[PDB]
Write a protein that binds this DNA or RNA. Structure first.
Lengths: 186, 539
RNA sequence: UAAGAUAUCAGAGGAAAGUCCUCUGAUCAAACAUGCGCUUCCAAUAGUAGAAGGACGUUAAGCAUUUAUCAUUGAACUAGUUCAUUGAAGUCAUUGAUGCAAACUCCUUGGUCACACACGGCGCGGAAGGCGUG
């Protein structure tokens, strides 16, 4: 070609020779102006709603949506989950096991090793003031140590200094586990 | 707007009015156009239709004055191309090719280049090239035309049997650049890599007869195909010996000398040697007897000296006696009558061609068209030849149309009231009309009783009675008046010797008898030796 | 243009609800091997062939069809038709386009393999799948 308005020089531009012009062929589809989807869509007639009864008498009972019952199984199971939780929330001023002296004196300790003892618990927590009581909590259904305890100090300032120190300090290492501390919460 | 601002401009009114004053000068047509394009400088589909229709009628009226301007037919299509109607771009190549009578190289080259892009149909686009080559294929500079055609075969077609078929022709033609086509043949022959591929060169038979090589030779082919090439490459080389002789002849004798191959104008003048080679290059081309190559080489030599008549005569002379086609020679002069500026040597010959062809109603119509040109005063013309060629052919019709009014079946020739009054009005001018005695000498030619008594009384007596000075001092007049009398078949020798010597000789004046005597002695010295003394004593 | 993610499922385990993570099953997928009396295909020389695909090749102006602008003004005209003038656009083509058919020429492809010229398999490959195990 002569002009070649391209980045390349004249040799490289003449190298991309195009195949000669496309032969013309008289078109077979519809012209772009005339193109349209089917118009004159006769609406859902009264005569159609009159001929529904031939269909309705034939299939009067529809088939059961059993794939919906897989969803009605799960959603109703989640509501029954709340009712077992509702059975628990009615049952802390009762438990006997949390019903010694002032709740402002009570530390929660949690994540304690399953294989701690109250004497090692007492050692660590007696670091922050004289103890009035301990109790590790154990599963009443079979006495797996639950991994929490409640520790009543002679003063709430020593209970909150024990809290300070041995929970926000990453969790007090006792035996081999990292033991959160909180106040009673409950 | 841009249109009306150009009309109210001063330079438009002066450049237009200049062209209508001096049409054929061209350099005013060229300024009228070169200006009017620049004044519409953005020339796209945008610009207003009054400005485009005006720039279309400049071109189309300008090519109607100068039909041999190859470039302005190209340049007018490209303007119709960019403006964007390729219908109207074709139409004005068609009108350009027909102007040259289908056989001009630059048009067919710069038509086909364009025609590649817009035809978009296989069988028809090659039909343009087939029609092209039969007119302008043998043109000596056609080298670059074929290089287009071979570019369009390779590119387009699939088979590769047409590419060998066409290239076999270009090998036999004496083009300027022929060696570029033997180089392409020899780049193929080498790249032939199977014996089946020698069938596309030439037939299965003519290989085995003329060269003795066989395609069905099953064996160890390598050396056999290495032989076939060496045997086949040879007869190319013998053809390269043939053509090269024809080219190097034509280059060294003719084409080397011809420095101008284009039109220019009616004011351009060609060199003397350039005319000398075109006259010889045309005679050489007649010898070859290649009719396509002959017609082309007249047309090719016409457009540089299209105004002379020198080539319009020969091109009709070739056609009239060699190719023996007289009706075709009539059309050349009619096409030549327009371009040439002498117009006289043609129109003498052109009358004669019509007469032999027996188309007298045309010629009588043609003589009416040349008397109507001067407004019934051909008699009064300055250049005698137009009158004299008119008169003798105007005579031939009125001998035929009107029956004769004299004895012995003599066609009342120059003596008829229609023509003789044109002649008598011509004689009356005397000193300025400048073709007097030659007209007078053909009035002698009647040689009978009635017609001598006519021409005596109706011209030779009345010329004495009015007594114009110019005619009586010119001895060619008195000589013709004696020869009118002497060769009359009616008179005997006695009265013919009386009537001249007793009456005609004494009517001259003694002062004129100085300058009349030399031409008047010559009549006497040859026909009347007996009465040569009686001449001398009188003067 | 951006964000997120790198098979799904189920069970046991570690940090009542869910998430995160790990080994055990099922199913799904890919790659690689490897089998199936698995399926289909792989061209004369004992001859100058032939199979698949083409030709944007020829015969070929084949044969048979149908196509070549509209508006304005005047004359003649039957009771539409032709001629001339003024404006509008206008792919090229009429050797066309559309339909019908044949003949010829030429191009690309392959196991032109081995054994045998012998009255409904189980030679050595290559190509293409289907199916099954690891």
């Amino acid at each position: 070609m002569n002009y070649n308005l391209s980045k390349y020089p004249d040799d490289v531009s003449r190298l991309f020779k195009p195949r000669p012009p496309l032969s013309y062929k008289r078109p077979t589809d519809y012209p772009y102006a005339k193109r349209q989807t089917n118009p004159n869509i006769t609406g859902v007639a009264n005569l159609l709603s009159t001929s529904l009864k031939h269909y309705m008498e034939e299939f009067p009972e529809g088939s059961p949506n059993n794939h919906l019952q897989r969803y009605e199984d799960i959603k109703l199971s989640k509501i029954k989950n709340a009712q077992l939780l509702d059975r628990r929330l009615q049952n802390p001023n009762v438990d006997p096991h949390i019903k010694d002296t002032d709740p402002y004196r009570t530390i929660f300790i949690g994540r304690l090793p399953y294989d701690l003892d109250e004497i090692e618990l007492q050692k660590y927590f007696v670091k922050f003031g004289e103890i009035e009581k301990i109790r590790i909590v154990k599963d009443k259904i079979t006495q797996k140590s639950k991994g929490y305890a409640f520790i009543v100090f002679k003063d709430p300032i020593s209970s909150k200094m024990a809290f300070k120190e041995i929970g926000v300090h990453r969790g007090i290492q006792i035996k081999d586990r990292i033991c959160i501390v909180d106040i009673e919460r409950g | 707007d841009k249109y009306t601002a150009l009309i109210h401009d001063e330079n438009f009114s002066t450049l237009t009015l200049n062209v209508s004053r001096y049409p054929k000068s061209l350099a005013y047509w060229e300024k009228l156009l070169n200006y009017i394009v620049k004044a519409s400088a953005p020339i796209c589909k945008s610009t207003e239709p009054q400005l485009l229709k005006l720039i279309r009628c400049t071109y189309s009226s300008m090519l109607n004055e100068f039909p041999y301007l190859e470039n302005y037919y190209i340049d007018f299509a490209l303007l119709e191309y960019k403006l964007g109607n390729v219908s109207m771009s074709h139409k004005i190549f068609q009108r350009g090719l027909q102007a040259f009578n289908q056989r001009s190289l630059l048009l067919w080259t710069s038509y086909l280049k364009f025609c590649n892009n817009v035809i978009s149909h296989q069988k028809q686009l090659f039909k343009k090239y087939e029609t092209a080559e039969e007119y302008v294929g043998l043109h000596f500079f056609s080298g670059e035309f074929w290089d287009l055609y071979l570019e369009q075969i390779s590119s387009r077609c699939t088979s590769s049997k047409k590419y060998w078929n066409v290239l076999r022709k270009i090998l036999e033609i004496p083009l300027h650049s022929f060696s570029k086509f033997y180089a392409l043949w020899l780049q193929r022959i080498d790249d032939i890599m199977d014996l089946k591929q020698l069938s596309q060169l030439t037939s299965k038979d003519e290989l085995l007869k003329k060269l003795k090589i066989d395609i069905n030779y099953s064996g160890r082919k390598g050396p056999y195909l290495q032989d076939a090439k060496k045997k086949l490459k040879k007869i190319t080389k013998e053809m390269y010996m043939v053509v090269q002789y024809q080219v190097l002849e034509i280059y060294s004798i003719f084409e080397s000398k011809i420095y101008i191959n284009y039109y220019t104008s009616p004011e351009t003048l060609v060199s003397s040697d350039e005319i000398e080679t075109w006259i010889k290059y045309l005679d050489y081309t007649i010898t070859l007897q290649t009719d396509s190559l002959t017609h082309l080489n007249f047309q090719r030599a016409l457009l540089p000296l299209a105004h002379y008549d020198l080539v319009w005569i020969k091109y009709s002379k070739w056609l009239i006696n060699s190719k023996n086609d007289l009706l075709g020679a009539k059309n050349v002069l009619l096409m030549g009558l327009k371009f040439s500026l002498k117009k006289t040597e043609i129109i003498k010959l052109l009358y004669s061609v019509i007469c032999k062809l027996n188309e007298y109603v045309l010629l009588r119509n043609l003589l009416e068209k040349i008397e109507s040109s001067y407004s019934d005063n051909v008699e009064n013309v300055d250049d005698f030849e137009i009158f004299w060629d008119y008169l003798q052919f105007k005579t031939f019709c009125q001998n035929s149309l009107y029956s004769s009014r004299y004895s012995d079946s003599q066609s009342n020739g120059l003596l008829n009231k229609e023509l003789f009054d044109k002649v008598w009005k011509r004689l009356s001018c005397k000193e300025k009309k400048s073709g007097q005695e030659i007209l007078l000498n053909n009035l002698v030619q009647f040689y009978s009783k009635d017609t001598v008594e006519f021409v005596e009384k109706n011209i030779f007596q009345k010329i004495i009675e009015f007594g114009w000075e110019y005619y009586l001092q010119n001895g060619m007049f008195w000589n013709c008046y004696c020869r009118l009398i002497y060769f009359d078949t009616s008179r005997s020798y006695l009265d013919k010797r009386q009537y001249i010597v007793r009456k005609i000789w004494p009517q001259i004046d003694k002062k004129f008898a100085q300058s009349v005597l030399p031409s008047l002695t010559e009549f006497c010295e040859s026909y009347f030796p007996e009465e040569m003394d009686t001449l001398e004593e009188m003067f």
